[PDB]
Amino acid sequence: TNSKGLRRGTRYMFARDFRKHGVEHLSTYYTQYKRGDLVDIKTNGAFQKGMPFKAYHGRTGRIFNVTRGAVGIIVNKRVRGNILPKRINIRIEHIKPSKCRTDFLNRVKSNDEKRKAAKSAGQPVPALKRLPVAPRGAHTVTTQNNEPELLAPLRFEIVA
Amino acid sequence: AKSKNHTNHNQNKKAHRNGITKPKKHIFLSMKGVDAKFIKNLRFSRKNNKRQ
Amino acid sequence: GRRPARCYRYIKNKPYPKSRFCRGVPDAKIRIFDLGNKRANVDTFPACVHMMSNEREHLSSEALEAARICANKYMVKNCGKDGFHLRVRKHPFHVTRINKMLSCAGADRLQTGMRGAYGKPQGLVARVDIGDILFSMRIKEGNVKHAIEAFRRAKFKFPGRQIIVSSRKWGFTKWDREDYERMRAEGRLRSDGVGVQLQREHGPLTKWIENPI
Amino acid sequence: VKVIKNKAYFKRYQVKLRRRREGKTDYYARKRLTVQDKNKYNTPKYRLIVRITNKDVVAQLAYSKIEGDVVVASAYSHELPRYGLKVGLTNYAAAYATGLLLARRHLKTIGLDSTYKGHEELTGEDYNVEEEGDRAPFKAVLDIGLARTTTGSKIFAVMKGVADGGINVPHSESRFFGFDQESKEYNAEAHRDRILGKHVADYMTYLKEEDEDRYKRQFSKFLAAGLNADNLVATYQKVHSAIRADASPAAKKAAKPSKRHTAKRLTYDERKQRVADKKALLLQLKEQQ
RNA sequence: UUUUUUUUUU
RNA sequence: UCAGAGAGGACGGAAACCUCUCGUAGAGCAAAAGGGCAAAAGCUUGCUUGAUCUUGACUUUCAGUACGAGUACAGACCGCGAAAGCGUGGCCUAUCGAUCCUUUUAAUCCUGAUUGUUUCAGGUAAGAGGUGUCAGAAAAGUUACCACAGGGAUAACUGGCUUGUGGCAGCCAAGCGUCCAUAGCGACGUUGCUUUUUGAUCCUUCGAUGUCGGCUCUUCCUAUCAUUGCGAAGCAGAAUUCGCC
RNA sequence: ACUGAUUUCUGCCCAGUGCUCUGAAUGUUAAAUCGUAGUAAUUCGAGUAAGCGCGGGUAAACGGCGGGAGUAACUAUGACUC
RNA sequence: ACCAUCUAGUAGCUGGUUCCUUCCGAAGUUUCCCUCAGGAUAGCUGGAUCUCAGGCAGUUAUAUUCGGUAAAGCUAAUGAUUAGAGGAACCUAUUCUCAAACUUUCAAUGGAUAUGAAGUUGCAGUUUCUUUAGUGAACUGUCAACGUGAAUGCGAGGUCCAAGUGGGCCAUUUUUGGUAAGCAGAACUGGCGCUGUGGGAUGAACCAAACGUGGAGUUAAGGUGCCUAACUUCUCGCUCAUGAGACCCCAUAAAAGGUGUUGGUUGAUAUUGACAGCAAUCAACUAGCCCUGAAAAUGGAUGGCGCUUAAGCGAGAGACCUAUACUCC
RNA sequence: GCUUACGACCAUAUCACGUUGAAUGCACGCCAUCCCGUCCGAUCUGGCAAGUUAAGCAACGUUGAGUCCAGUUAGUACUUGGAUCGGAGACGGCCUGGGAAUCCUGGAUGUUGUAAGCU
RNA sequence: GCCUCGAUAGCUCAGUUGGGAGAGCGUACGACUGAAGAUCGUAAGGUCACCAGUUCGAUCCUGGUUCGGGGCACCA
């Protein structure tokens, strides 16, 4: 059976990217994190303190605590037939803001702005629902300067 | 009479038998494990806000 | 004695090269890989013949050397030592394993059964795939018949099925004969002994002048 | 000899950060100097940058952001001729004056100068701006850069100037001039004399006694400006008084028209034409040689 | 106190 | 700023020390391997004891128990630094221990119930003494004189799968065969067949399938020793060899 | 207790394990006893028998009883030597 | 030794464990145990129900992310490894072949998160936390306005009590040990175990399809010369075998050969008359069927009989037969 | 069109050779009493302003190497799901959807924020 | 097959943590003897079995390879 150390099997997971080692750029620390925000976990091997466990690498969680240089995150973990909301204290260097939630917030902002503008201007309430791409509509194609080319299968050729 | 025989054959089926239970929605409301200093300040703030 | 080739014929295990983990590997039987007029100039031998495999099996070093000697003797006797250039395009790098067992009466007393059956190195075999080139050779257009006959005689020394074909390329180079001739006439291909090098455009005009292309 | 800086070397090479390559920013110290605790969120953390060039002293106040630092105030020694001094814009007195100018200027700008006047009597004793009223004093943390931290350095002279001006700069008297490393004693009188430039006047007198030619060679433009070994201290005191009297930044001029002074990059067609011309010339020379 | 040997014919 | 390279300098040499250039880490970081690290996490050096006191929360194993290890804070007192800051041992991933008992430290502590004082003893809290079978009994053999409950979950004989090994048969021809590869053989290679060898497995049988050999008696298969009919020879014939039905 | 008529013999080893004999032997030794401290429980120390440990004997007591090289006027072997 | 009693001694082991219908319905897996034929523990399961009446999903869409396997690369680092070329080694640019414990690069399947009322905007208070600072952070208010913001499907959630199980086995794909194994060990999923039914002559696992008790109709897989319900049905070819062949798993066959026959590819000669003898021919290949390679013991197996312009092989067409499956009663 | 201080992204920014550089500035530079540190005022530190764009630095040049982007490779390699699909097998194709990467070819050679200044 | 042990002058054997390679016999030189042998005085001598690593330096410490030697190899 396998050994049950903390960093077993993380040879490539905790390694830096090629031609990307060295000093950590400071936007990582300048980024603002607030309780309730969503963040992705990607371990940075260069910082051995406050590392997340390998099972949370590449997972998204929600911040519930903001300390001096770390954050408490609630991450869903599958254990048999239940999903446990585990709490982990991860340092900033292993954390990155998640863009899915900010995109949704932008969409909600746009929805509210469009609704308010239409209501103020007296227009009907516009459609504010994402719709699956519908089947292509009817159209016409012209062959002018685009005459059809007759295609046929090619014979087999011995390519030595 | 070898008797180690570990496997994970039917475990996913057993887990999905009753459905995979997602976490509740009130877990984000508790302030368990939050900074002691922040909790102290929050307690002071809540103790003093005038109802009307 | 050596086990039958049918035991290690098909490819079943992952590659097992000789390295710091696998020690005490006996030397492979085939050592020489280029025979005939190997030091020939690129233009000496414009015609080229390949011998491809149609099986995914193991070509033992023993079989590879047997085919090498057979073809080499045939060509030395039929066309002279300096009339061809043969290249064995397959190196034996996969290590097979044997779990030796005693075969005398009463061996069961000391036999260990299947407990701890990891084997020890036995020999070096070359992993081959469909479309892989086993033997190649470059000769003059007047010796293609001898080339095909030599490859015919040699193929019977290998397991499975092999197909002998003639390549459109200029010898062992990577250009079809017509393009090679045109590029050499132009000045884009510099002799590299057996092969040739493409002289690309980009770079300082100072080295450009040495051979304006 | 095998070539070391080859194709593979350049393929695998990773370049350091731009400022580390330029040898201008120490990122190890920068991270500790500029990073704010995440539980203080977007509250700026203020840094007092001190730099000394060959001919000028630069003092700045800044705070960091994701897209670059934000300088909020600045003061340069070359801006002292408006408050007097024409020469010696790099010595201890000039450094202290620049620090004081920066402190007073920014306090005026943020409207705290009246509340906080700082130490208005030069004595050389360690001074920490004490909180007055409710608004705490403006706070900044010193940034020396790549300068060596030696006792009596002009970077600490600028820091002392700012602290006297009335900005809360955490510090200790250990690295001020007049602090004896052996006995760990602080000589406020010596520090005050160094701030007022008595060392410059002493050097002037020493060289004047030793040799006239060397004295002239050393203090050429000081004499041209009319500063001698009996006026410098009063001049520096007047400079301090003027700085404290007025500290607003000088007005800006108009944008003069600009013309290209450097070559402009050739275009693709120009480069190809030059290639063709060189090819033709090289062929001509090869034929004629 | 210790002190073994000397090829064949002449 | 390392490993290393290049070029110079009395004794000095391939190798002592000095000097200048280049040097993306090709060195070093106690140890195994893997990650990480260049004004450092490496080397030199100054000062120090945060390897200290205290409670909770969390991660890892996981039953989401315990120990161990670790993470981020909070309170105290400190160390270094000019300062921002960093510090609860080792750059990270292993380096370890329950109950009972003994022992030590802690309170100007609690109890000994006939009242008190002092010894003595027992308690509350934190460590140590160890269980390496490491969630932790105190433990030498033999039985062919043997016994019991079971097991075909498990061996020895047959049977079953496999055929490494054993046996038998093919393909290309380098050579042997006075000359001549194929009369007859056939190396180096290589393709198959068989279960009269021995192995591998453990499917059936342990509320029993009597376990070697010989004798006796049937029948069956041939990969043909002899005989019948033939073909080929290194077939002039007693003789002998190969092959076919 | 072992061996096992008669005949002829019964070699070497007391290192190990046994058995046995001397004891001056302060080497180690229990209870009891004696002394010290303490108001007492109690603490500390001294003696302290046999045995063990030191010495001797014993194998018709249990038992045990070696290696490596060179070497002779043909070779082989090795009386002989290390 | 025997007799009585303790004694109905203990047994994690073997055997048995007695009425009918109805509904639901498993496990051979995790951790600890002197534990490996056994327990406890979680998981799977039943029952009792209770609180409510939209938030969920073994499925997709959108958005954002994680990975280092297949492929790719070594003329990029490390490790192997052939050959020369230009300046014996050395340098330069190349070159052949490789990596479970190599990699710049890097899929498909796959994992995770979010997609509004528990939301968005403001106003107006609290704080001893934070800031030079209403500067922030968080919270508070019977605050004011706005009103459901991808598809499809569907009612959701809570507590308690407890059984059996804790020997598994098989299959497509991936995969380690082994020469292999109806061998040993794993990953995903589906099955058998627990399960009948039509078909594969027969079979725990294969194909179809899951089951109250009956009827009519239609089918799935499979089949239609007789066994045997359904055509000696229709069209075109190929095959002669001195025991041909005949339908997933499946019940063995290879290298190498044939001047048997049928189609194709290439290169030549030929009517200035092509090969044989004193009007097409020649040569090398190729792949369908057939033949040789092809030896085992009771007499025997396309299931049997038999079948030869087939009742065989391949491509097809009509109709027809037949489930506990589908529709209706 | 530029210089400096502090930066963000961290080679389109690196590396090699060369040309040019107005003004500010940066830089080299002179001295070593004092503070300060060294075997050594080389570094570090302090006081200065005679001289120079020689170097650094900036802009530009190179059929420049590297880096980056794009095309090609290619609907190829690989791959999800299906078949009482072909083949003795190894394997192969078909149906249904995803879909790369080298060589090679072409192009680009830093963008930008705060503050101060020159033109 | 498994488990151990050893390998050092020409031969037989020590040797240290790791900083010396020794003891005896043998070989060479001189002396005594008429000569040899004994005896006396001198000298030189090892593949530290081979390889890789660990530390400042390894015969030694660690790992692997070659040779030799020892013990076990039992049920039925």
Ligand SMILES: C[C@@H]1C[C@@H]([C@H](O)CC2CC(=O)NC(=O)C2)C(=O)[C@@H](C)C1
């Ligand atoms: C700490 C360790 C253990 C301890 C002691 O023996 C342990 C006990 C444990 C128990 O429950 N019952 C016992 O009889 C023994 C002891 O004296 C030493 C070995 C040291």
